């Protein structure tokens, strides 16, 4: 019927003038007479039959007064086994050139979070194979995980490792959502997924869904692409009931995207320019990613730290919603330690004496206390060497270096970068490895033999060989 008419176009925000029967908020509107159909979500009713909406695609080419049709429903994206192995757009359009997606029903990307009555704990550890992770901040399936890191610190490489170790062996479906990232990784990930046989064109395979909101998309798209992929995950959680691995690339872009459009929507800037609805908008997206009685969703979410400022409102508020935390430090990367995980900043709710074995708890605190004490002395160690340091303190410093170097290990996905084969460390080997190291097993060997090693026994073989050659 085209009851709406474009009133004004300002960047990604477009207003539409209707004669009557205004659409509800969050409803999807389609502009007519423009290739590459544009979808507009209702956000505010400015009055006088004027509604302000956000644009998902480039607004270049729009003309004031152009008609607009009211669908009467929010953006509905296809969900079901058809999305498996298929790449979707922020508005549910397939961008993989694979044909139309076969979905039983179209669910709206806007939905309320699960109630308080429908909530499950699911306190079960998730062995990822990374000793530094399983030791300090062990991930638990069905809980929320957060990866904090700056520009070029190893967030993507870490995600690829988890996918190789967890997603492949996983039984239930999976969902990958990219928000404001380089499209090259999306292409490499898709082809890499096909080569690994994780996904195939044959029907009945590819127990994993792919969603991409790469930077090429304009504002508004990177802010709602997560809801699209999240809706695909909620379907498997409630309807299918099986476990789901919701891989979410850097999410800071979502919050950033909102800020990029908040100013245009007439909102007053926040402390450092963000939108005032950052907490609520982010909360609605975060409260929906939770395990319930129907199914569990183990979400691995990356958080980009702007300018390495952890005190920024966006990442700071995210900590309160995460169960397991893994903060990546750039200082470690300079030293060559990979994965550059900060053990004193990587917090995890799963770490407690009652949930995990008491031995695992003691070994964890032993390493944290060791590194914590060493960290309290790095200042003086910089001004002057450790020679003048006390004997007991020198032992702490010496053993701290051994543990720090042993934390690093090569990844299978990062095999091309370093050039050495990856390592998969079992949980039992992880605990036993650090247990013997804290006791003073490999203290006699040089700290170099522990660099990029999988198990403690591997470092001893290298350390013993280094002593034999000389």
């Amino acid at each position: 019927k085209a009851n709406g008419q474009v009133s004004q176009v300002i960047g990604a925000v477009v207003d539409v003038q209707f004669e009557g029967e205004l659409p509800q908020i969050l409803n999807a509107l389609e502009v007519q007479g423009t290739q590459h159909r544009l979808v507009l979500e209702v956000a505010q009713h400015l009055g006088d039959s004027r509604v302000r909406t956000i644009a998902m695609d480039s607004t270049e080419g729009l003309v004031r007064g152009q008609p607009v049709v009211d669908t009467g429903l929010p953006i509905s994206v296809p969900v079901g086994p058809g999305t498996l192995g298929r790449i979707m757009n922020v508005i549910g359009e397939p961008i993989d050139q694979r044909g139309p997606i076969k979905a039983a029903k179209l669910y709206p990307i806007h939905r309320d979070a699960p109630s308080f009555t429908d909530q499950a704990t699911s306190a079960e550890i998730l062995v990822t194979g990374i000793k530094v992770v399983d030791l300090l901040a062990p991930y638990a399936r069905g809980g929320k995980i957060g990866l904090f890191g700056g520009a070029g610190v190893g967030k993507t490489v870490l995600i690829q490792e988890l996918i190789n170790n967890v997603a492949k062996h996983h039984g239930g479906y999976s969902v990958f959502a990219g928000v404001g990232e380089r499209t090259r990784e999306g292409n490499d990930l898709y082809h890499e997924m096909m080569d690994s046989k994780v996904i195939s064109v044959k029907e009945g395979e590819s127990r994993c869904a792919l969603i991409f909101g790469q930077m090429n998309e304009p504002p508004g798209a990177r802010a709602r692409v997560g809801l699209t992929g999240l809706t695909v995950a909620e379907y498997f959680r409630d309807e299918e009931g099986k476990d789901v691995l919701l891989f979410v690339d850097n999410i800071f872009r979502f919050t950033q995207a909102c800020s990029e459009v908040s100013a245009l929507l007439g909102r007053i800037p926040s402390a450092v320019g963000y939108q005032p609805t950052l907490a609520t908008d982010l909360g609605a997206l975060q409260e929906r990613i939770t395990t319930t009685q129907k199914g569990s969703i183990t979400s691995v979410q990356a958080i980009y730290v702007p300018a390495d400022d952890l005190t920024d409102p966006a990442p700071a508020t995210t900590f309160a919603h995460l169960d397991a935390t893994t903060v990546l430090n750039r200082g470690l990367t300079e030293l060559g330690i990979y994965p550059a995980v900060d053990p004193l900043d990587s917090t995890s709710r799963m770490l407690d004496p009652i949930t995990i074995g008491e031995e695992h708890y003691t070994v964890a605190r032993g390493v944290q206390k060791l590194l914590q004490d060493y960290k309290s002395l790095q200042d003086i160690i910089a001004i002057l060497g450790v020679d003048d340091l006390s004997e007991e303190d020198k032992l702490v410093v010496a053993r701290a270096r051994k543990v720090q170097k042993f934390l690093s290990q090569p990844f299978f996905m990062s095999e091309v970068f370093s050039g050495i084969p990856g390592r998969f460390v079992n949980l039992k080997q992880n605990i036993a490895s650090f247990k013997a190291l804290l006791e003073g097993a490999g203290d006699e060997y040089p700290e170099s033999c522990f660099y990029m090693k999988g198990d403690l026994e591997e470092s001893l073989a290298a350390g013993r060989a280094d002593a034999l050659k000389s």
Binding site: H45, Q119, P276, A320, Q372
Partner: protein, 512 residues
């Protein structure tokens, strides 16, 4: 009461149900966005008055302008549309209060989210009410046992004061609150109404999964029977997060005005300031420093100032507040933390370094302080608490010389070791509250220097074994310390004699 008599009264009560409806003015919404609704007309409306939309969700009229009215949507604003009807109820925001609140979980507005059944309550109090004057108050002279050794000994909390749990993320801020609720459960079982303390936990901007885990622990320990949980999650609108603190506070005033004792625990208030900031910014109000409104200080002050110790004329009730504050990078010089510190009486600083060095609860005694001081501690505690502070003070000084080394005087080695016993003594696990009388015994053995004999690694386990040994054999001793509340000389000699004796009895590492 016979079953027939009760049924008749039940039927008679259902008979006497009145329902009157009067003309209520209504207005149209000029605009709606981000939860803010500009209403046309709807004159003679009071500030903060409750209004109902077409869908059935409520609203609070905050901005009363000559042109329109600024209303905040108390819920999801998807169904609201331009020109919709808005009916004014005629009553300021209020919430249900009473004894039935205990054992349930409500939201900011007061609706139960447990799903068990409807709330059976008849008393409703206004959320925002003027705080007590100067005369109704009374000096705080009753201890509020939290169950933590370091807290009950160094930073005593008396019923009627305001203590601030300040720290960084994952520093044990919530762990302290849980331990307090668990400790009060014992006093609830025993018939001592003068020591029962109703617990109220206000969750503002927290994931429901965490609150779900919180409630399960209370039921596990059977401590939910006297706990009230108000939930204002992140998905909840900012006004809900803004009213939940005051909402739960009104529930506490019930026990306060009724001569009872209630403990309200406000979660991170920085989340309230963001919701309050968000609510203010969306109303087109001029922002202040850090984008927060100008009267943000009045917010927390108005909320915390209500907690007081009512005089005996009004029943002698008391309301204790334990607001929590989350710091970004341990910087207490920020605007919001600085204000809250000046409002509360004492503050508990949590350090991340101490947490990872094995000092859990990671409490920085150097900065923590309480206005009430020894006025709340019991006689048996003040005597031992005074010396404990001095000993710990010296140990922090000698900490540096430990690195210097190369020599150590006979006394310095003792003071260095003695302090190490206290630090190892104050440590406490999670979900393990201790009785007040038990702490007096352990804290006593530490200051006296008996812990200097056994190795430090054996002090923590010695605590458990010593307490168990006392409860079985020395039961009359604990009764006197509990009833009289004072450590008589007879108890000192007996206690001073068994502590060296027990250390030799049990199998420990006596070599210092």
């Amino acid at each position: 009461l016979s079953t027939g008599e009760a049924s008749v009264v039940l039927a008679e009560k259902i008979k006497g149900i009145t329902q009157q409806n009067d003309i209520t003015e209504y207005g149209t919404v000029i605009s709606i966005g981000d939860g803010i609704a500009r209403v046309f007309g709807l004159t003679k409306v009071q500030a903060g008055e409750m209004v109902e939309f077409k869908s059935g969700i409520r609203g609070m009229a905050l901005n009363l302008e000559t042109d329109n009215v600024g209303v905040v949507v108390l819920g999801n604003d998807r169904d609201i549309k331009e020109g919709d009807v808005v009916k004014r109820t005629g009553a300021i925001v209020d919430v249900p209060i009473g004894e039935a609140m205990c054992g349930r979980v409500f939201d900011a507005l007061g609706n139960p989210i447990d799903g068990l059944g409807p709330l059976k309550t008849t008393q409703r109090a206004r959320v925002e009410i003027k705080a007590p004057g100067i005369i109704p108050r009374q000096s705080v002279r009753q201890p509020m046992q939290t169950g933590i050794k370091c807290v009950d000994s160094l930073v005593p909390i008396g019923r009627g004061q305001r203590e601030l749990i300040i720290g960084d993320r994952q520093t044990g801020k919530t762990a302290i609150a849980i331990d307090t609720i668990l400790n009060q459960k014992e006093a609830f079982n025993t018939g001592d109404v003068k020591k029962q303390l109703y617990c109220i936990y206000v969750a503002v901007g927290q994931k429901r999964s965490t609150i779900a885990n919180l409630v399960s622990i209370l039921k596990q320990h059977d401590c939910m029977k006297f706990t009230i949980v108000v939930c204002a999650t992140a998905s909840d609108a900012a006004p809900l997060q803004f009213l939940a603190p005051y909402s739960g506070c009104a529930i506490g005033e019930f026990f306060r005005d009724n001569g009872k004792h209630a403990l309200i625990i406000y979660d991170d208030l920085s989340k309230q300031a963001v919701a309050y900031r968000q609510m203010s910014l969306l109303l087109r109000r001029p922002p202040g420093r850090e984008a927060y409104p100008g009267d943000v200080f009045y917010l927390h002050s108005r909320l915390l100032e209500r907690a007081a110790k009512m005089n005996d004329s009004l029943g002698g009730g008391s309301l204790t507040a334990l607001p929590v504050i989350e710091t970004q990078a341990g910087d207490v010089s920020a605007y919001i933390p600085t204000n809250v510190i000046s409002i509360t009486d004492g503050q508990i600083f949590l350090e991340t370094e101490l947490f990872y060095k094995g000092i859990r609860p990671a409490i920085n005694v150097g900065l923590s302080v309480s206005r009430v001081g020894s006025a709340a501690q019991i006689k048996a505690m003040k005597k031992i608490a005074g010396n404990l502070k001095l000993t710990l003070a010296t140990y922090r000084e000698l900490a540096a010389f430990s690195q210097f080394g190369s020599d150590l005087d006979a006394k310095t080695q003792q003071q260095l070791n003695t302090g190490e016993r206290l630090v190892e003594m104050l440590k406490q696990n999670q979900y393990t509250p201790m009785k007040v009388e038990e702490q007096v015994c352990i804290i006593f053995a530490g200051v006296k220097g008996f812990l200097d004999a056994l190795v430090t690694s054996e002090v923590l386990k010695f605590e458990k074994k010593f307490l168990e040994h006392v409860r079985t054999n020395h039961s009359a001793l604990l009764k006197r310390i509990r009833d009289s509340g004072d450590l008589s000389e007879v108890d000192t000699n007996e206690l001073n004699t068994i502590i060296p004796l027990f250390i030799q009895e049990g199998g420990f590492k006596l070599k210092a």
